[PDB]
């Protein structure tokens, strides 16, 4: 029956009710109980506040109009008002004080995730205060999590006025019988019920939910803590920068603030950051999730030299150059991590801070060459099998779906022998033709990667592994340096190829290196433990990158 959940802002998705603050201001200032609220609701339908609620006048225009009310109302009850009394000062404080009632927003999401059409019906105003950005940001966040957002000062109708409820109904394209309306104000519930909608008086959050859980027959309370917000490719802003005649890099941009450039690994995409992209943005940053040269919508020249670490790095400096960014926080995973370490070693000027996940910085050995060293570690055997051009491509491209479902797996799921790969003659030689779906990725998520690699295949990506000798000779130029800029090394316990023990000597080249670890975390960090990663990175960015 029910198919729509509509939430109120002040007192439901947002607390504490910017409203309530009035009652406290009075108690606080020992003012006649209701003095402030009466001046607020003064004029009723023809009130200054009702106007301000219908978008007739701005909040800034209202404040003075709401001051007079505090004098008239004070003139009736035979009272006064302190000298430092400020309606502005009061509301700015009340508003910024209000925060997203997390459990409520989550309850809303759940409903949506299970077929419900969500919407926010609220009696708000046109905020032109200097601190208006407060609201702006709060909404900037809530907005995305709801199909609709019906603002009073926008639709020219406020709440109890039935008109708006017909509007809501008509907007949702649903009849009262299949809609749940939650408000903290009783009056706003009647019109709702008179239409025959399920209404819930939201007093204490937990109870409202109980009723909601009840009426909707979905478990909203004491429910497992979700995964961070994932972003829909088609809703993202896509960016393209030509760094060289035949090379254009594609990236997804979201947020404002210190620029944080995310460089995924092999064989991934910008999408590999789908969980930290909103989080970090929301965290106060301007996230630039890259599509590393050779992947997704980025250029993939066939040439192997085109993917040596030096070239790749210069192109990233150029990417910044073209974008007008002097610096930028570089956070990389897998190959991306290798890339950002060399970005801090050759372009400190452009790297605001450096951070790597799984990939440890290990100064190249002046004597022994890469090929030799790699051969000295059964786990890296897969890298040798990536040398012969075409060979690896053929297997990986054979069945994209199977390729990604076989790769992207938790540490406990495995299904890909990694020891004797060159020996087995293949990476999948003894793997299922139809691998089970990993916990980390949904069918869609995998198909996204598929369509992406259908463009340029695995030749470009694989070439990242085909410049060992070159990258080595380059790295040798930096054997005298040291990472002195803010750095963070996040290691993942259950990563059996990029084992944490490999980063134990990093502090020698990176003295003030900070760290992070993650339990039961396979190689595919972003996907495996998204919450932990966002938490770890934001904490670090906030203390070392925002400066």
Ligand X SMILES: O=C(O)CNC(=O)NC1CCCCC1
- Restricting to residues 259-298, which ones interact with Mg ion according to CB under 5 A? none
Q: Residue 174, Cβ neighbours under 10 Å: how many? A: 18
Strands (E), 117-256: 117-122, 148-151, 179-183, 198-201, 237-244, 247-255
d(CA 320, CA 326) in angstroms, rounded, equals 7
Residues 4-43, mask of contacts with Mg ion (x by CB under 5 A): ----x-xx--------------------------------
- State the minimum distance, in angstroms, from the CB of residue 285 to Mg ion: 32
CB of 19 or CB of 85, closer to Mg ion: 19
Q: Show Cβ contacts of residue 64 under 8 Å, excluding neighbours closer than 6 positions.
A: none
Residues 277-316, mask of contacts with a copy of itself (x by CB under 8 A): ----xx---xx-----------------------------
Task: Point out which span in 187-195, 292-300, 322-330, 334-342 binds ligand X (CB under 6 A).
Answer: 334-342
Q: Quote the tokens at residue 481.
A: 């340096």
DSSP string, 458-519: THHHHGGGG-HHHHHHHHGGGTT----S-EEEEEETT-SSS-GGGGTTGGGTSTT-EEEEET
Contacting a copy of itself (CB under 8 A), which of 29, 77, 97, 137?
Answer: 137
Closest CA to 271 of 297, 289, 293: 289
199 is in an annotated binding site: no
Which position among 38, 127, 334, 544 bears the catalytic label? 334
Contacting ligand X (CB under 6 A), which of 334, 381, 445, 528?
Answer: 334
223 is in an annotated binding site: no
- 230 contributes a contact to a copy of itself by CB under 8 A: no
Which position among 333, 465, 495, 544 bears the catalytic label? 465
Q: Quote the tokens at residue 385.
A: 């099998």
309 in Cβ contact with 467 (< 8 Å): yes
382 is in an annotated binding site: yes
Q: How far is CA 85 from CA 23, 47, 90, in A?
A: 15, 22, 8
When computed from its CA atoms, the radius of gyration of the chain, rounded to whole angstroms, is: 28
123 is in an annotated binding site: yes
- From the list ligand X, Mg ion, a copy of itself, none, partner contacted by residue 8 (C-beta under 5 to 8 A by kind): Mg ion
Residues 16-55, mask of contacts with a copy of itself (x by CB under 8 A): -----------------------------------x---x
Task: Point out which span in 410-418, 464-472, 479-487, 536-544 binds a copy of itself (CB under 8 A).
Answer: 479-487
Per the annotation, the verdict on 334 as an active-site residue is yes
Q: Quote the tokens at residue 185.
A: 């104000």
d(CA 516, CA 276) in angstroms, rounded, equals 16
Beta strands at 14-15 and 148-151: parallel, antiparallel or unpaired? unpaired
- 498 contributes a contact to ligand X by CB under 6 A: yes
8 is in an annotated binding site: yes
- DSSP class of 285: -
Catalytic residues: 334, 465, 523
Contact positions toward a copy of itself, by CB under 8 A?
51, 55-58, 60-61, 126-128, 132-133, 135-137, 139-140, 143-144, 154, 156, 234-242, 253-256, 259, 281-282, 286-287, 320-327, 346, 348-350, 352, 477-478, 480-482, 484-485
């Amino acid at each position: 029956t029910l198919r729509a959940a509509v939430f109120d802002l002040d007192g439901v998705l947002a607390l504490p009710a910017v409203f309530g603050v009035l009652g406290r201001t009075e108690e606080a200032l020992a003012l006649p109980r209701g003095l402030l609220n009466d001046a607020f609701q003064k004029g009723g339908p023809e009130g200054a506040t009702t106007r301000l609620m219908k978008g007739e006048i701005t909040l800034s225009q209202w404040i003075p109009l709401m001051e007079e009310n505090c004098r008239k109302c004070s003139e009736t009850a035979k009272v006064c008002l302190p000298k430092n009394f400020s309606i502005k000062e009061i509301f700015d404080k009340a508003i910024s004080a209000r925060k997203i009632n997390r459990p409520m927003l989550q309850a809303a999401l759940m409903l949506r995730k299970k077929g419900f059409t969500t919407a926010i019906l609220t009696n708000t105003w046109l905020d032109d205060r200097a601190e208006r950005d407060g609201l702006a940001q709060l909404m900037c966040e809530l907005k995305m999590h709801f199909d609709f957002l019906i603002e009073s000062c926008q639709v020219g109708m406020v709440k109890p006025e039935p008109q708006i409820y017909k509007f809501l109904l008509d907007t949702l394209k649903a009849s009262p019988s299949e809609v749940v309306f939650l408000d903290d104000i009783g009056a706003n519930l009647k019109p709702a019920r008179d239409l025959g909608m399920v209404t819930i008086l939201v007093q204490d959050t937990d109870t409202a939910l109980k009723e909601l859980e009840k009426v909707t027959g979905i478990q909203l309370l004491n429910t497992p803590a979700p995964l961070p917000t994932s972003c829909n490719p088609s809703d993202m802003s896509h960016g393209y920068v030509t760094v060289k005649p035949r090379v254009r890099l594609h990236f997804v941009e979201l947020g404002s603030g210190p620029a944080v450039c995310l460089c995924h690994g092999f064989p991934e995409s910008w999408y590999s950051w789908r969980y930290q992209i909103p989080a970090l943005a929301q965290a106060g940053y301007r996230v630039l999730a890259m599509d590393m040269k050779g992947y997704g919508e980025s250029s993939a020249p066939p040439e192997i030299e085109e993917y040596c670490m030096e070239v790749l790095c210069k192109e990233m400096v150029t990417f910044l150059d073209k974008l007008g960014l002097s610096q930028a926080v570089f956070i990389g995973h897998d190959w991306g991590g290798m890339l950002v370490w060399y970005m801090a070693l050759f372009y400190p000027e452009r790297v605001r801070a450096v951070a790597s996940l799984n990939t440890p910085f290990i100064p190249a050995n002046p004597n022994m060459s890469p090929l030799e060293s790699i051969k000295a570690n059964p786990v890296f055997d897969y890298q040798l099998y990536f040398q012969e051009p075409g060979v690896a491509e053929a297997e990986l491209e054979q069945n994209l779906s199977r390729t990604f479902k076989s790769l992207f797996r938790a540490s406990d799921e495995s299904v890909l022998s990694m020891h004797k790969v060159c020996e087995a003659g293949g990476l999948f030689v003894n793997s299922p033709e139809e691998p089970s779906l990993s916990r980390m990725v949904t069918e869609e998520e995998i198909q996204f990667y598929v369509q992406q690699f259908k463009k340029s295949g695995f030749r470009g990506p694989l070439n990242w592994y085909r410049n060992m000798e070159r990258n080595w000779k380059w790295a040798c130029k930096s054997l005298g340096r040291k990472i002195l800029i803010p750095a963070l090394m996040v290691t993942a316990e259950k990563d059996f190829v990029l084992v944490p023990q490999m980063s134990q000597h990093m502090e020698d080249w990176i003295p003030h290196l900070k760290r992070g670890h993650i339990e039961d975390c396979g190689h595919w960090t972003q996907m495996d433990k998204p919450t932990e990663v966002n938490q770890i990175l934001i904490k670090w960015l906030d203390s070392d990158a925002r400066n």
